[PDB]
């Protein structure tokens, strides 16, 4: 493979680890989700352009649309959490246990 493929894959891995490891702010994790989506977009676009598969040139656009849907969902949930607690910290979300 090209080394750019490894760079994009490691970008995805770093963003996934950033999401999986949580600091105080909820907003930081949403940004990590958006970063994973961006890396997926870049990787899929590179794969589609390299192989000249004409019909999937539209697939990353659909990816972006559902990324926007995910981001809107996350922001709405953050609005409700911050309205409840006055802060978007994840440690406030501990009313429910296992």
């Amino acid at each position: 493979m090209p080394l750019v493929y490894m760079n994009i894959i490691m970008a995805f891995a770093i963003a996934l680890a950033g999401l999986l490891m949580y600091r105080s702010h909820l907003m930081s994790s949403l940004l990590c989700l958006e970063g994973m989506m961006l890396s997926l977009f870049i990787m899929s676009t590179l794969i589609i352009l390299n192989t000249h598969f004409t019909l999937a040139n539209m697939m990353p656009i659909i990816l972006l649309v559902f990324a926007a849907c995910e981001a809107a969902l996350g922001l709405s949930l953050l609005v409700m959490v911050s309205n409840t607690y006055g802060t978007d910290y994840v440690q406030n979300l501990n009313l429910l246990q296992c």
Binding site: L16, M37, S44, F53, M59, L73, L77, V81, T84, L95
Partner: protein
């Protein structure tokens, strides 16, 4: 919520699940999952409270992570083969990502932590939907790619799911958490047989869905979410408690009840493949689920707990809303063992 809006959201959830069901293209399956999650998030929050908000947030985070892993696996599979069809993945790493993603979507161990909390934080109707309808799509995807799964990882996750479901259910007094741990154990049982026979997985899915629907409807009818609240139902609706006790015995897998048939068929199918140790451990561990079912039956129907004075006023009122399918679900959850050979129609 406007009833029209609620109907539209439920139809959107169902249509996303059906899109996952009928698609031949990986992108369309991903789209179905995305639409299902998007329409599912408001349903968890229909009755607004901080607990519902927290449950919805945890659910969204878990499912979004699973969706990201799903898409990454699809992209790897495309990279190593210019294929979009869901037939059999061509890369072991992509397949491992796919398995981890689908297990996180299903709530299999060790990705089980979200299920009890989300189930506890929502209403009983949302819990019913989450524990019945939300399992169809990832299970269908796993059924389509069954020949590609690594048996070691899948069976490890299934055994962990059964063990953790039993142990977690041992410690619960809230009914929703009990049902969530029961769901985790049943998912483990279902995914244990998937690498060998998808028909067994489908049969286990159908029986588990029937029993879970009957149990959740019985819990809605007697509007209780804790053990002590359900302990009062004998003094107002003894028939409901008796049906609950019989359904609980069925869920424990005791013959000649219906819940025994999926475990029996899974064990015999696994023995056909020279797998003896793991089904033995699986049954010996489902003994724990039977134990906490029996504890609930002791507290609910077989003995009579003390009641309160205000129950006399409740004695004078009937149920305004009646559930149409509750009688059928109870009968199918209990008395369908003699109809076992009908499973051939599932393949």
């Amino acid at each position: 919520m406007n009833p029209i809006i609620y109907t539209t959201l439920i139809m959107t959830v169902m249509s996303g699940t059906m899109l996952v069901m009928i698609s031949s293209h990986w992108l369309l399956i991903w789209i179905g999952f995305e639409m299902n999650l998007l329409a599912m998030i408001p349903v968890l929050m229909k009755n607004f409270n901080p607990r519902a908000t927290e449950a919805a947030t945890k659910y969204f985070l878990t499912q979004a992570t699973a969706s990201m892993m799903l898409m990454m696996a699809i992209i790897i599979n495309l990279l190593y083969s210019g294929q979009w069809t869901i037939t059999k993945m061509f890369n072991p790493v992509a397949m491992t990502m796919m398995t981890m993603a689908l297990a996180m979507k299903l709530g299999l161990s060790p990705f089980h932590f979200w299920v009890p909390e989300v189930t506890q934080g929502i209403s009983l109707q949302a819990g019913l939907l989450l524990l019945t309808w939300q399992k169809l799509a990832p299970l269908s995807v796993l059924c389509q790619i069954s020949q590609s799964i690594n048996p070691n990882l899948m069976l490890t996750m299934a055994m962990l799911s059964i063990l953790i479901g039993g142990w977690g259910g041992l410690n619960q007094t809230q009914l929703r958490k009990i049902m969530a741990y029961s769901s985790i154990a049943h998912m483990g049982w279902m995914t244990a047989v998937l690498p060998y026979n998808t028909t067994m997985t489908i049969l286990n899915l159908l029986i588990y869905i029937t029993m879970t629907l009957a149990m959740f409807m019985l819990l809605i009818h007697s509007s209780a979410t804790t053990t002590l609240s359900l302990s009062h139902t004998w003094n107002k609706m003894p028939v409901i408690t008796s049906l609950m006790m019989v359904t609980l015995l069925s869920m424990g897998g005791l013959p000649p009840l219906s819940g025994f048939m999926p475990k029996w068929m899974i064990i015999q199918e696994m023995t056909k493949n020279e797998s003896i140790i793991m089904p033995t451990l699986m049954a010996m561990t489902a003994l724990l689920n039977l134990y906490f079912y029996m504890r609930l039956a002791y507290s609910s129907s077989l003995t009579m707990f003390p009641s309160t004075n205000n129950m006399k006023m409740k004695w004078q009122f009937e149920h305004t809303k009646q559930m149409k399918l509750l009688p059928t679900m109870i009968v199918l959850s209990t008395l369908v063992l003699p109809m076992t050979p009908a499973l051939s129609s599932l393949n």
